[PDB]
């Protein structure tokens, strides 16, 4: 309908009237502060994750006090997460796993030290910790449903580097948030880190996350496993780099993707990308609902939005999957635009 499907086996029907927990988990990465891996520009990227997620819980950003618009003049996508907290009534908590600057709203501290250098093989000493400190908060969140996002810059690097590590075929296929991608600084950045690592066909899932990964993913996935056990729904809230977490959640626990009650949810944006291949990624990791919002950007009066039409902002924050969570439970998806468009005086 507004809603995109490819392998919906009676997921949405799970999801429908059900009560949900969002949360966003947000990191940093070293790298980032040096080498151009991400489009959030150098002077910003150390705020931008904390600013989201004030956006979405509180109303505003309070570390950054400018308005949601990023280097091309795009709403940055917490403006369609807050739409759907706002319009659909979400309880919603965040969580922190090493942004450069936490925020100033209550969220969950669970790893104070950023991610670390990607290139060097070195982004984490614990992902099996990390895993269990989301599993084992996972058990004390109650909600019928889970609707999981992120938000980290230079997500779309160790995306690709954990798949890669993993033995996906995923070059031309993680893409970007922006439509320009520097796919091969990218990708020299996290073959480069591997290589340091050791990583190869013998590799625990830990040790490539602690290689190349980025602290988001071990905290989603300890999140995602732990609903998922209690047989509930989970929708990954993000674009490909829920399919490298999802590819995660296969190592560890092949056997609860055989439940079907983890999906990717995400935006028409990421799935319809020239320059990338999420249905691609997802169909070598396994049979696992795909689902994606479509939100008629096209007609919008604010022009910023017209720009997620071209590629320039496409996912974030878990906007693709909080929509999906409202569109499904009868949001009129015309509704996330207004009040984005409403809402542009602050």
């Known amino acids: 309908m507004s809603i995109i499907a490819i392998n919906e086996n009676g997921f949405l029907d799970k999801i429908k009237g059900r009560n949900p927990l969002f949360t966003c988990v947000i990191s940093s990465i070293e790298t980032t502060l040096s080498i151009p891996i991400s489009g959030v520009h150098r002077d910003v990227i150390k705020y931008t994750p904390s600013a989201d997620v004030e956006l979405v819980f509180y109303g505003k950003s309070l570390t950054l006090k400018t308005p949601p618009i990023d280097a091309t003049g795009s709403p940055t996508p917490a403006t369609i997460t807050r739409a759907c907290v706002e319009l659909k009534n979400i309880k919603n908590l965040h969580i922190d796993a090493g942004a450069f600057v936490k925020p100033k ?15 060097e093989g070195k982004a984490m000493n614990n992902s099996k910790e990390l895993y269990m400190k989301g599993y084992l908060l996972g058990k004390n969140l109650d909600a019928e449903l889970l609707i999981v996002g992120e938000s980290v810059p230079g997500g779309t690097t160790t995306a690709l580097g ?30 480069e880190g591997l290589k340091k690592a050791g990583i190869n066909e013998k590799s625990s899932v830990f040790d490539v996350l602690n290689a190349v990964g980025d602290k988001m993913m071990p905290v989603v996935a300890g999140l995602a496993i732990s609903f998922a056990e209690r047989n509930k729904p989970v929708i990954l809230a993000g674009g490909t780099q829920m399919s490298a977490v999802l ?50 950007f096209e007609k919008a009066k604010i022009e910023g939005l017209k720009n997620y039409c071209k590629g320039s902002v496409k996912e974030g924050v878990g906007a693709g999957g909080i929509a999906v969570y409202s569109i499904v439970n009868d949001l009129e998806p015309t509704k996330i635009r207004e009040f984005i468009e409403n809402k542009f005086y602050e």
């Open 162 to 191: 954990v798949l890669l590590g993993l033995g996906y075929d995923a070059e031309g296929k993680v893409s970007s948030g922006s439509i320009n991608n520097p796919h091969e600084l990218k990708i020299k950045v996290v073959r």
């Open 247 to 296: 590819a995660v959640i296969k190592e560890i626990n092949k056997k609860v993707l055989d439940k079907n009650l983890i999906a990717i949810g995400t935006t028409e944006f990421v799935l319809n990308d020239k320059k990338g291949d999420l249905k691609g990624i997802v169909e070598q990791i396994g049979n696992v609902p795909v689902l994606a919002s479509k939100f008629y």
């Open 105 to 119: 709203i209550p969220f969950i501290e669970i790893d104070e030290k950023p991610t670390g250098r990607i290139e």
